[PDB]
Amino acid sequence: NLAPLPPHVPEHLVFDFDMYNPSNLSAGVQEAWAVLQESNVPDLVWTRCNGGHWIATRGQLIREAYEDYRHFSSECPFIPREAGEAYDFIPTSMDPPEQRQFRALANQVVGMPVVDKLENRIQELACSLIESLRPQGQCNFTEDYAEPFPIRIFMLLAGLPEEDIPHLKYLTDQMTRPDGSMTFAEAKEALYDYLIPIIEQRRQKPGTDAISIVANGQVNGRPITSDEAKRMCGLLLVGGLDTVVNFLSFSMEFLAKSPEHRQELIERPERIPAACEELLRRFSLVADGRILTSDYEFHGVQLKKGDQILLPQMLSGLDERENACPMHVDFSRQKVSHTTFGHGSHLXLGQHLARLQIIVTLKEWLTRIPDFSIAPGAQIQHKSGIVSGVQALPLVWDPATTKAV
Numbered sequence: 001n002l003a004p005l006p007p008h009v010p011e012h013l014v015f016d017f018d019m020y021n022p023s024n025l026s027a028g029v030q031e032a033w034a035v036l037q038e039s040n041v042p043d044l045v046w047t048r049c050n051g052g053h054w055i056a057t058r059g060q061l062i063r064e065a066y067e068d069y070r071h072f073s074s075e076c077p078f079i080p081r082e083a084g085e086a087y088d089f090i091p092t093s094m095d096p097p098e099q100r101q102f103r104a105l106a107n108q109v110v111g112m113p114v115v116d117k118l119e120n121r122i123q124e125l126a127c128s129l130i131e132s133l134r135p136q137g138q139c140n141f142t143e144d145y146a147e148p149f150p151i152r153i154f155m156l157l158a159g160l161p162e163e164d165i166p167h168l169k170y171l172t173d174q175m176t177r178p179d180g181s182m183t184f185a186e187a188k189e190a191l192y193d194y195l196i197p198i199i200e201q202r203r204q205k206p207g208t209d210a211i212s213i214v215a216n217g218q219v220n221g222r223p224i225t226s227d228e229a230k231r232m233c234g235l236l237l238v239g240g241l242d243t244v245v246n247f248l249s250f251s252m253e254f255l256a257k258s259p260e261h262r263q264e265l266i267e268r269p270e271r272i273p274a275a276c277e278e279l280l281r282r283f284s285l286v287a288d289g290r291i292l293t294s295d296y297e298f299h300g301v302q303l304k305k306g307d308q309i310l311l312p313q314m315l316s317g318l319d320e321r322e323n324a325c326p327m328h329v330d331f332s333r334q335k336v337s338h339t340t341f342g343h344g345s346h347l348x349l350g351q352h353l354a355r356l357q358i359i360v361t362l363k364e365w366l367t368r369i370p371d372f373s374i375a376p377g378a379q380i381q382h383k384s385g386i387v388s389g390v391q392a393l394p395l396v397w398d399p400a401t402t403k404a405v
């Protein structure tokens with residue numbers, strides 16, 4: 001239900017949006033969030049859902065808030081409040097100045113140089129998975145590709161058993177789209193329960209995996225503590241297991257449904273990177289936020305100290321004030337404007353990994369399985385949260401239309 005309105009919040013700003021179960025979910029998750037950008041809805045509304053919080057509805061406000069960490073702190077970045085208070089991943093839960101020393105370490109485990117070195121494993125895995133599926137004439141896209149392809153790479157990188165995937169993924173999802181059986185805090189603590197012994201053990205006898213590197217790293221010239229290492233490793237796991245995994249299904253769903261757009265990429269493969277980018281805008285999927293460090297007036301609205309404000313990364317590129325005809329996918333879009341990977345000082349650090357992962361998928365999939373569709377009569381269900389996703393994507397094709405090598 002709906003938390004009672006705080007004395008400081010005027011009635012005309014109330015729009016009761018639930019980010020975990022939005023009213024128009026059936027029409028598509030990006031579409032359900034876009035109801036916040038209809039003509040009679042303010043730039044800045046208060047929802048009585050999920051304990052009560054603000055939502056900036058437009059790119060300009062979202063951008064401004066992300067830049068202004070002095071008023072909009074990451075210390076409590078998740079809705080509901082219990083989740084933001086329990087949230088303590090590094091660097092995400094820290095503001096500058098302290099946040100920054102940690103980014104460099106994180107970079108050492110997921111940035112460009114790590115990515116260049118993983119690139120042949122990544123390509124190899126995409127081809128392997130796709131060739132395996134090709135002759136079946138069908139798949140459950142989420143289980144058979146969108147999960148194993150990003151996730152086996154991350155486990156490879158982190159030096160963790162593939163048999164640990166289901167427990168890890170379960171826990172991760174409880175932190176972005178809870179089924180209601182675990183609080184944020186309960187899942188985080190269970191994530192820590194798993195990491196703690198491994199981090200110590202990798203501090204005792206370091207390897208060349210990501211956990212060893214974080215575990216034995218330095219932070220602006222001094223050693224990382226055990227507790228900090230854990231709070232960093234947890235964030236990497238979440239990003240490894242619940243970002244690209246969901247993005248791929250939005251993109252594949254779209255491609256299953258538009259043969260023209262497939263044909264465009266088959267016919268002009270040089271368009272793939274630009275296509276990646278337009279799809280990143282279109283099927284944007286993250287929505288975290290910040291907390292007010294003081295009473296502050298912002299675009300003519302009075303915010304109180306401790307108020308939570310959701311600043312949906314998803315919404316900036318769907319905003320018609322940033323991109324005309326924003327629901328329309330155009331790979332030749334002259335100026336693709338979005339905040340898919342964030343804005344300000346917390347700007348995504350796995351974005352090179354993610355764009356490689358996307359681009360490789362587009363290429364290797366259309367190469368082998370050019371014609372394909374949604375299974376007969378399947379109604380694709382989406383799910384909303386910190387990171388939205390797709391419940392299931394059953395796909396079909398005629399193997400005769402496909403090409404191996």
Ligand code: HEM
Pocket residue numbers: 074077090091092093099103106110235236237238239240243244247285286288289313339340341342343345346347348349350351353354
């Ligand atoms: C489609 C893919 C992805 C999207 C849309 C995405 C989105 C984002 C967003 C919106 C933020 C900012 C959070 C905030 O400002 O509070 C962020 C930060 C971050 N992301 Fe990504 N992400 C993606 C893939 C990945 C991957 C694969 C990783 C690998 C681990 C990753 C690692 C991180 C890390 C470590 C941060 C924290 C940086 C900081 O707080 O300074 N992301 N990401």
Ligand SMILES: CC1(C)[C@@H]2CC[C@@]1(C)C(=O)C2
Pocket residue numbers: 089092176235238239243286287288386387
């Ligand atoms: C919003 C995010 C996608 C960003 C990386 C993982 C995530 C869930 C975070 O906790 C920070």
Ligand SMILES: [K+]
Pocket residue numbers: 075076077084085086087088093
């Ligand atoms: K916190």
